[PDB]
Design a protein around this ligand. Structure first.
Ligand SMILES: [Cl-]
Ligand SMILES: [Cl-]
Length: 162
């Protein structure tokens, strides 16, 4: 298992524009297009992202290309962030994947707001971080996915994904 397979499980793959759990136009493997309620705005963000006239449908290769860029962007967002970077550097490889998963889902600023959780993660207080992580809109809105990510931070294993 790895970050790619982990996010593929958590996000799924859809080849036609869909609404994500928040109601936002999304495509592929959790690639958010726009927060605007306009499907036309989505389609135009999508043509721009793919570089051709898609009319709201993309191939699997194209979904996987966006996915690669988004995993890459999430890692870079962590490394460029003063609050995220030192926690990430402190983590083993499995728990680093949980951090990328979170940034992917909610962005760099969202995650950087888990101030107390970040500190407990840095100190390797795993059970306490896990309790704190769960007290969040994140966990209440997407409990199954959040439980999987939390268990990964808690145990440092891929058990929640097998
Ligand atoms: Cl893009
Ligand atoms: Cl979920």
């Amino acid at each position: 298992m790895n970050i790619f397979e982990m996010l593929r499980i958590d996000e799924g793959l859809r080849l036609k524009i869909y609404k994500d759990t928040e109601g936002y136009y999304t495509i592929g493997i959790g690639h958010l297009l726009t927060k605007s309620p306009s499907l036309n705005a989505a389609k135009s963000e999508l043509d721009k992202a793919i570089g051709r006239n898609t009319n709201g449908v993309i191939t699997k290769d194209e979904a996987e290309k966006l996915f690669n860029q988004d995993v890459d962007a999430a890692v870079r967002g962590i490394l460029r962030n003063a609050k995220l970077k030192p926690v990430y550097d402190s983590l083993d490889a499995v728990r680093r994947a949980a951090a990328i998963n979170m940034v992917f889902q909610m962005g760099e600023t969202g995650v950087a707001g888990f101030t107390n959780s970040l500190r407990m993660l840095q100190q390797k207080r795993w059970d306490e971080a896990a309790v704190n992580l769960a007290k969040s809109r994140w966990y209440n809105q997407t409990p199954n996915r959040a439980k999987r990510v939390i268990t990964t931070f808690r145990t440092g294993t891929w058990d929640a994904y097998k």
